Amino acid sequence: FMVSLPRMVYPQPKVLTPCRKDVLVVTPWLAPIVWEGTFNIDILNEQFRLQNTTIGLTVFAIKKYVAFLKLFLETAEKHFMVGHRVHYYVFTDQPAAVPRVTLGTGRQLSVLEVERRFLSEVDYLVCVDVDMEFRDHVGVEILTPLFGTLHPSFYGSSREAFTYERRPQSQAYIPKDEGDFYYMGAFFGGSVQEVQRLTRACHQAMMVDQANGIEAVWHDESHLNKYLLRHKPTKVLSPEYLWDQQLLGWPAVLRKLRFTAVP
């Protein structure tokens, strides 16, 4: 049961005026491709707040990667799901090394030293790399049952150029005539149920490869791509959500650089 939205005043959408004329904003299976200009964040914030949505953000920080936590968490506080309930889950081998970052109200952080817990604590799970920083808004526009993010190095490439696992002996195998996009393993998510299904499928597939004495060319990312090929994501995030300005600059097609690699 979803409550009704309140009266809102905003620009009327124009049926005969395309959102963006420079990029694809919807996939062939009718999943929105999230680019700046395609969404009214006020409407989306209302929809998700009315459901008291809680987003879990998971990050792994092992060995020297614990050094990336301060900037990651501090910038997430400024740009990630602001206004909504957020639960950070930091998986680390050095609990005492996690920085003391000040959090806004309605936001919490749990340290797990290295789950049915996720199902009862959050509505959506967002899984990202820790050696990153938020530079702009990353909000509820990304929430959906299952989403993948376009790899910044292949968004304009042909499927034949995609670095999928090409060996038939691997469970992550994808032939040259298949593939929608090349998703980067550094940023994916969805409902807890869908994320756990994906993680479970990949874990089992990797065990099979290991038993067959083979390791996918790009490990977890290769399996993620195989999964998303066979289970189409309900939303795809544009490269605005996974960029590297030092290596790729700032092209016009990107109106905002939201989540980037740390040099």
Ligand SMILES: O=c1ccn([C@@H]2O[C@H](COP(=O)(O)OP(=O)(O)O)[C@@H](O)[C@H]2O)c(=O)[nH]1
């Ligand atoms: O020694 C390591 C190596 C990797 N990671 C985690 O694994 C992620 C992905 O691997 P990495 O970032 O090192 O390579 P990349 O994703 O940039 O190709 C890192 O962001 C961390 O979240 C970690 O915690 N400790």
Ligand SMILES: CO[C@@H]1O[C@H](CO)[C@@H](O[C@@H]2O[C@H](CO)[C@H](O)[C@H](O)[C@H]2O)[C@H](O)[C@H]1O
């Ligand atoms: C310009 O060539 C591209 O350079 C990128 C940055 O080194 C490479 O990024 C890697 O891409 C891999 C998959 O092909 C993995 O995603 C890996 O984690 C990335 O660092 C890119 O491969 C290469 O084509």
Ligand SMILES: [Cl-]
């Ligand atoms: Cl992750």
Ligand SMILES: [Hg+2]
């Ligand atoms: Hg638009």
Ligand SMILES: [Hg+2]
């Ligand atoms: Hg996760």
Ligand SMILES: [Hg+2]
């Ligand atoms: Hg994760």
Ligand SMILES: [Hg+2]
């Ligand atoms: Hg998989």
Ligand SMILES: [Hg+2]
């Ligand atoms: Hg995966």
Ligand SMILES: [Mn+2]
């Ligand atoms: Mn990384």
